[PDB]
Amino acid sequence: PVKLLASGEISRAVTVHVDAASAAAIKAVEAAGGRVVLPE
RNA sequence: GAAAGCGAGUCCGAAUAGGGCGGCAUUAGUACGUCGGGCUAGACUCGAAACCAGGUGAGCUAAGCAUGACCAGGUUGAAA
Numbered sequence A: 001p002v003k004l005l006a007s008g009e010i011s012r013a014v015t016v017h018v019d020a021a022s023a024a025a026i027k028a029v030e031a032a033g034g035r036v037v038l039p040e
Numbered sequence B: 001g002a003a004a005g006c007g008a009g010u011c012c013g014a015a016u017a018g019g020g021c022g023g024c025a026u027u028a029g030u031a032c033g034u035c036g037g038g039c040u041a042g043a044c045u046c047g048a049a050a051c052c053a054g055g056u057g058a059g060c061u062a063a064g065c066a067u068g069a070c071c072a073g074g075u076u077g078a079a080a
Helices: A023-029
Strands: none
Touching: none
16 A cells, blocks of 8 residues: 655645555645545 | 554654664666676586495305216224
8 A cells, every 4th residue: 555754845735545644744735735535 | 663553754761862764965776788706506627435226246256955977096904
């Protein structure tokens, strides 16, 4: 499976479809505008 | 990180000392080739004494069995 990690900092609206993400990765996509969709 | 796992953080720990990593001030790989070296094969070439497998030999020699052959001449003089 995939994973999102907080390294880049430009801020933009993005909708991510990863299988998991780090605390500061989710709390970075939302703060910049956008949703992170993790399955059931 | 032993792992679960967490993630530019993570591991010991009960939070503060530190290991390893990131940013590093910071630069990049991958495929094929030729060459250096490594590993694995007989591994630069040549050489054992030996160990193991299957077979060949008793026409030599050691013996055994079957059936044949051989021992001039002279001396001594047992029992009965």
